Amino acid sequence: MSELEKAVVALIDVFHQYSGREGDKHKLKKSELKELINNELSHFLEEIKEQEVVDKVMETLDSDGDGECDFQEFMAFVAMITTACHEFFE
Amino acid sequence: MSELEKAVVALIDVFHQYSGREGDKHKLKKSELKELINNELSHFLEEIKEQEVVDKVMETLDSDGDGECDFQEFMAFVAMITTACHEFFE
Ligand SMILES: CN1CCc2cccc3c2[C@@H]1Cc1ccc(O)c(O)c1-3
Ligand SMILES: CN1CCc2cccc3c2[C@@H]1Cc1ccc(O)c(O)c1-3
Ligand SMILES: [Ca+2]
Ligand SMILES: [Ca+2]
Ligand SMILES: [Ca+2]
Ligand SMILES: [Ca+2]
Ligand SMILES: [Ca+2]
Ligand SMILES: [Ca+2]
């Protein structure tokens, strides 16, 4: 696989690693999302230690309002992080 | 870096590898986009060999209509490929 193909598969893998922990195995609840950010973006994003931050993140990502982050909403999250990563050095 | 962090950086890297070849170094023209797909998604996507397919792909991705694919539009492309990759086995 190319680096791009590996990256695509890595996005799928990390989503399911976390979404499969509790409840709907195909969506991230608040706790799953929090651990995803804290464990897997520890170099990019500040560790989340406040409920209010967890709440605000979910509220931002939860486009359809069902209180969870589904795959499509996670793709939008990845675009946000990647864009922020890309804009950091400008 | 985590796998997710590596993936984020890989998206940035592949975009610039191709966008930096000709013209605006921060956007993909048709030829840059074609080679990106043919070289870096050879296992996922059919190789593009027809002008009409290259045209249709750019038309689909070029949300703002400037005839090129910028970083934001590339993020949407990545979401499309990843979603298609994710839905393939269902
Ligand atoms: C390892 N790289 C080599 C090639 C390259 C070429 C332009 C830009 C970047 C990179 C990267 C990583 C990178 C990370 C964060 C950013 O904000 C960036 O703008 C870039
Ligand atoms: C290596 N993997 C291990 C874990 C895992 C768990 C669910 C789903 C997938 C994966 C992947 C790759 C994968 C690739 C394409 C898909 O359409 C998928 O649904 C998955
Ligand atoms: Ca879940
Ligand atoms: Ca389990
Ligand atoms: Ca949702
Ligand atoms: Ca270019
Ligand atoms: Ca050059
Ligand atoms: Ca454009």
Side-chain angles (χ1 to χ4, degrees):
Chain A
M1 280 194 288
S2 69
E3 297 304 305
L4 175 52
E5 288 167 332
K6 289 178 188 166
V8 167
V9 179
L11 299 182
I12 294 167
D13 277 347
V14 74
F15 176 78
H16 281 282
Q17 275 157 25
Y18 288 82
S19 73
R21 286 173 173 198
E22 302 181 13
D24 189 327
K25 297 205 177 192
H26 302 270
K27 303 182 189 175
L28 299 162
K29 52 164 52 159
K30 281 173 183 184
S31 60
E32 296 170 332
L33 178 59
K34 173 187 173 180
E35 302 292 3
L36 187 148
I37 287 155
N38 290 350
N39 294 336
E40 314 301 337
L41 296 167
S42 65
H43 306 102
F44 287 173
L45 300 199
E46 199 134 276
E47 173 181 1
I48 298 174
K49 309 178 183 177
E50 287 301 324
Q51 186 66 55
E52 66 194 14
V53 176
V54 181
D55 296 347
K56 186 57 66 176
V57 176
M58 181 61 85
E59 176 178 17
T60 303
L61 305 179
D62 183 23
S63 294
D64 65 6
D66 68 0
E68 299 202 46
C69 187
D70 63 24
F71 191 74
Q72 187 188 5
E73 293 160 342
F74 182 69
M75 297 289 95
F77 183 49
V78 174
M80 285 175 48
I81 300 157
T82 307
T83 301
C85 188
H86 191 215
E87 286 175 344
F88 187 87
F89 282 139
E90 310 287 282
Chain B
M1 280 194 288
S2 69
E3 297 304 305
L4 175 52
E5 288 167 332
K6 289 178 188 166
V8 167
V9 179
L11 299 182
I12 294 167
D13 277 347
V14 74
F15 176 78
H16 281 282
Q17 275 157 25
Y18 288 82
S19 73
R21 286 173 173 198
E22 302 181 13
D24 189 327
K25 297 205 177 192
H26 302 270
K27 303 182 189 175
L28 299 162
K29 52 164 52 159
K30 281 173 183 184
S31 60
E32 296 170 332
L33 178 59
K34 173 187 173 180
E35 302 292 3
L36 187 148
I37 287 155
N38 290 350
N39 294 336
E40 314 301 337
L41 296 167
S42 65
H43 306 102
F44 287 173
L45 300 199
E46 199 134 276
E47 173 181 1
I48 298 174
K49 309 178 183 177
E50 287 301 324
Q51 186 66 55
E52 66 194 14
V53 176
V54 181
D55 296 347
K56 186 57 66 176
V57 176
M58 181 61 85
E59 176 178 17
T60 303
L61 305 179
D62 183 23
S63 294
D64 65 6
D66 68 0
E68 299 202 46
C69 187
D70 63 24
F71 191 74
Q72 187 188 5
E73 293 160 342
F74 182 69
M75 297 289 95
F77 183 49
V78 174
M80 285 175 48
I81 300 157
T82 307
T83 301
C85 188
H86 191 215
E87 286 175 344
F88 187 87
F89 282 139
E90 310 287 282

